[PDB]
Design a protein around this motif. Structure first.
Motif, short mmCIF file in Angstrom:
data_model
loop_
_atom_site.label_atom_id
_atom_site.label_comp_id
_atom_site.label_asym_id
_atom_site.label_seq_id
_atom_site.Cartn_x
_atom_site.Cartn_y
_atom_site.Cartn_z
N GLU A 208 0.80 -1.23 0.00
CA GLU A 208 0.00 0.00 0.00
C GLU A 208 0.84 1.28 0.00
O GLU A 208 1.54 1.57 -0.97
CB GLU A 208 -0.99 0.01 1.17
CG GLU A 208 -2.15 0.98 1.01
CD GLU A 208 -2.44 1.76 2.28
OE1 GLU A 208 -1.73 1.54 3.28
OE2 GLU A 208 -3.38 2.58 2.27
N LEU B 16 -9.92 2.26 -0.26
CA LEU B 16 -8.98 1.16 -0.48
C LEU B 16 -9.60 -0.24 -0.45
O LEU B 16 -9.36 -1.05 -1.34
CB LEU B 16 -7.82 1.23 0.53
CG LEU B 16 -6.87 0.03 0.54
CD1 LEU B 16 -6.17 -0.14 -0.80
CD2 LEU B 16 -5.85 0.15 1.66
N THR B 163 1.02 -1.41 7.31
CA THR B 163 0.15 -1.25 6.15
C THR B 163 -1.30 -1.28 6.59
O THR B 163 -1.59 -1.60 7.74
CB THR B 163 0.39 -2.36 5.10
OG1 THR B 163 -0.30 -2.03 3.89
CG2 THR B 163 -0.12 -3.71 5.61
#
Lengths: 376, 375
Positions: A208, B16, B163
C-alpha cells in the motif's frame, strides 16, 4: 445450502500454514477435502504448539473438516491410489518447495495428461519461477525481504515483524482466490490450470502506502508508526490508563474533537486550522492532546469523543476482541471438535454458516475407507 | 486474457478496501465500470501523493477500470444505473451499511431488478451486528481486532502493522467471495449477497495470537521478531544492517555455529537442544550478535547460506521491488506510465502483461457509457 463448492473434490497435500489456510476455505464452503499426509508424524502442524489435550490447536485451527489419509508416493501401490484420486479430483493442492512434486513423478505436464480438468494449485515462498524459487522462505524471511518489517514499528525504533504470519496468510488467501478463479474459468474452457502463488508476491501486494510514497518521492522506508500519512489528528494516543485511537480526518471533526477535549482554542490556531497544517505539526498537536487525555481513563474519553461524533476506539487484546458481541453476531468464533476457533469471514446469503462444525481429523483417521474408495 | 472475460462489474466502491477487491477482477478479464460521484469522484483521486496529474493512490488500485459519474438521486442517472444492473453480473459497494438501501437499492430490490446479479459489499463490521453502523477506518479495526496489541517489540507500546491490513484483508476476501458466488451461480443460475467485514477478515489473520490465548488464557503474546518454538529464529544486527537467521533444528544450529566460529555452543548444556535454545535465546542472541557485529551483512549472508542455514536481509520496500525475483514474477508492472504492484495470482494460460491500461480520468468513459446504457 452447504456452500458453492459442494460436490468438488480437493486432493490436499498442503502442510504447515500457507497452503492449508487456503484449502480450509474451500472446505468451509462445501468442498470435500482429503488431506494426503506423508508417513511419519504427517503434517508438520501436528507437532506445533500450542497443545490442548495432547492435540495441536495449530493443526485443528486450519484443518477442521478435512479428512486424513497417509500415503507414501514413493510406494507404487500408494502411488496408484493417488493417481486414481487425481482422476476423480478437481483440485490438487500442495505447498512443498518447488520441484518436489516433479521428482515424485508429478510435473504440471504429467498432471495434465492424468486429468485434463484438474486444477493444480501450488503455494511457495517465491513461486515456481524465478532465481529465488529454490531459496528458503519462512514467513519471517518473506516479511524481511518484502519491506514490511522496515515499514513496521515506531519510526525511531528498530524494524519489526508484523504481529502475525502475514506472508503465509497472504499466500493462503491468494491460493484460495486463485483456485476459485480457475474453477470459474474451467467451467467454460473445460480444462484445468496451474495456480502458482508466491508468498513474496502476495506480501508485495499488501504494501500500500509504503510503495506508493517511494515510487513518488524516492524515500524508503516510510516508518509512520501509528499515525496516518495524510490526516491528523489520526493516530494512537495515550490516556490515564490505556491507549485509544482517534481518527479525525477533517476540519469539521477536528472542531468536534477540540470541543470534547475542551481545547477549542486550537481550532483556529494557525498551527492547526487546516488538515495539511495539522499533519505538518502533528507532533505538537499530539502533545496538546495527550496532556488533556492523561487526566481521564480511556472509558471516559470513549464516551465523550464518540458523543461529539468523532471516530474513536480502544486498543483491544485478542482476548477482548473475540469476546465482543459483534464477533458472536458474525459467527467468527466457531466450535469445531469441541474447540473454539476462528470462523469464516466470507458470508454469502443462501449458504449455511453453522456455529458448530466437524472437527479436525486424527492422523490417517479416514485412511482405511479412503484407500478402499480409490483402489483399482 | 483471464477467467472473468465477458463479465460486467458495476463498481461503486471507493477508498482502499472495496477497490482492492474489484481491481483483482479487472486484472483477470472482467469489464469493471467504476461509478463515481460527479465532481469529486472516488475519494482517492484527492489522496496523495501526486504524479503527472494523477493520484498514485487512485491509480494503484483503479487502473483499467472505466469511469462514469452518476447521481443516484438524479432520476436520469438512476435510470441509466438501473439498466446497468439488469445487464451486470456483479454490483460492488463499500459504503456504510444502509447507504445503498437509502438510495433505493436493498438486496431485495436488487434481486428483482436482476435475479442473477451478485451483490457484494465490504464494510468495517459487515451489514449485521451491533457495530454495523460504527466508524471503522483501517486503524480502528486493527486496534479493536487485537493485531496492534500483538505487534511490536515485547516491552514496547502496541503498534499498527506497517500497512492497511484490515482493508487489504477485506479486499481479498471481497474478491474471493465474489468469485465464489460466481462459481456458485454457474449451477444455481441465481445471484447472492456477498457480505464481508474488515473486522471478521482481520480476526481470521490472528494466527498464533488467538491460538495461544485459546490454549493458555494469556493475551496478548508480543513476541516481536522471535519465533515462539524455535531458536535461534529471530532478527539479528550486524556491523551495518540487520538480518534474519531462521535456524529450526540441531543440524542447522551446528552448521550455523560453524559459520560464526561458535562451535563451542554446539555441546554447551545451555544450547544442546532446540528446547534449550528457546529457553536461553536471549543470552544466545547476545553471543551471536557479538560475532555478527564484526562483519557487514553481505559477508554474513554469504557465510551462512554457504553452510545451508536459512538467512535473509531486512530490505526496504525500495530494495524489494528492485530484486530480480520481482521482475521474474512481473510484480512491478506499468499502467499509464506509472510503476505499480502487479497481480500475485498467476494462472497458467492466462495473460500477465507488464504493460496494462492506466487509470481513468474522472468521467472519461461517461459520454460513451451513458449512451450505451440509456434505454
Amino acid at each position: 445450502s452447504k456452500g458453492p463448492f459442494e460436490g468438488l473434490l480437493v486432493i490436499d497435500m498442503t502442510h504447515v500454514l500457507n497452503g492449508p489456510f487456503g484449502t480450509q476455505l474451500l472446505c468451509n464452503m462445501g468442498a470435500r477435502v482429503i488431506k494426503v499426509e506423508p508417513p511419519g508424524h504427517g503434517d508438520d502442524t501436528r507437532t506445533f504448539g500450542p497443545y490442548v489435550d495432547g492435540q495441536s490447536l495449530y493443526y485443528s485451527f486450519i484443518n477442521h473438516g478435512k479428512e486424513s489419509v497417509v500415503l507414501d508416493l514413493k510406494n507404487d501401490h500408494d502411488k496408484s491410489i493417488f493417481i486414481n484420486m487425481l482422476k476423480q479430483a478437481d483440485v490438487l493442492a500442495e505447498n512443498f518447495r518447488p520441484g518436489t512434486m516433479e521428482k515424485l513423478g508429478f510435473s504440471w505436464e504429467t498432471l495434465q495428461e492424468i486429468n485434463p480438468r484438474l486444477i493444480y494449485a501450488s503455494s511457495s515462498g517465491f513461486g515456481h519461477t524465478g532465481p529465488l524459487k529454490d531459496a528458503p522462505a519462512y514467513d519471517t524471511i518473506i516479511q524481511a525481504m518484502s519491506g514490511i518489517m522496515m515499514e513496521t514499528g515506531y519510526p525511531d525504533a528498530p524494524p519489526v515483524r508484523v504481529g502475525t504470519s502475514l506472508a503465509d496468510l497472504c499466500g493462503g488467501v491468494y491460493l484460495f482466490s486463485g483456485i476459485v478463479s480457475a474453477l470459474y474459468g474451467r467451467e467454460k474452457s473445460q480444462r484445468g490450470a496451474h495456480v502458482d502463488i508466491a508468498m513474496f508476491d502476495a506480501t508485495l501486494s499488501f504494501l500500500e502506502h509504503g510503495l506508493m510514497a517511494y515510487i513518488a518521492t524516492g524515500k524508503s522506508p516510510q516508518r509512520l508508526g501509528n499515525r496516518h500519512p495524510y490526516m491528523a489528528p489520526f493516530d494512537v494516543f495515550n490516556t490515564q490508563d490505556k491507549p485509544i485511537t482517534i481518527c479525525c480526518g477533517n476540519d469539521k471533526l477536528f472542531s468536534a474533537l477540540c470541543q470534547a477535549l475542551e481545547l477549542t482554542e486550537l481550532v483556529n490556531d494557525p498551527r492547526f486550522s487546516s488538515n495539511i497544517l495539522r499533519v505538518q505539526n502533528q507532533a505538537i498537536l499530539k502533545q496538546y492532546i495527550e496532556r488533556t487525555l492523561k487526566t481521564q481513563a480511556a472509558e471516559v474519553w470513549l464516551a465523550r469523543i464518540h458523543e461529539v461524533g468523532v471516530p474513536v476506539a480502544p486498543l483491544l487484546s485478542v482476548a477482548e476482541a473475540i469476546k465482543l458481541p459483534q464477533t458472536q453476531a458474525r459467527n467468527m468464533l466457531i466450535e469445531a471438535g469441541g474447540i473454539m476457533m476462528p470462523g469464516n469471514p466470507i458470508k454469502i446469503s443462501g449458504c449455511a454458516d453453522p456455529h458448530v462444525m466437524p472437527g479436525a481429523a486424527t492422523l490417517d483417521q479416514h485412511g482405511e475407507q479412503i484407500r478402499q474408495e480409490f483402489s483399482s
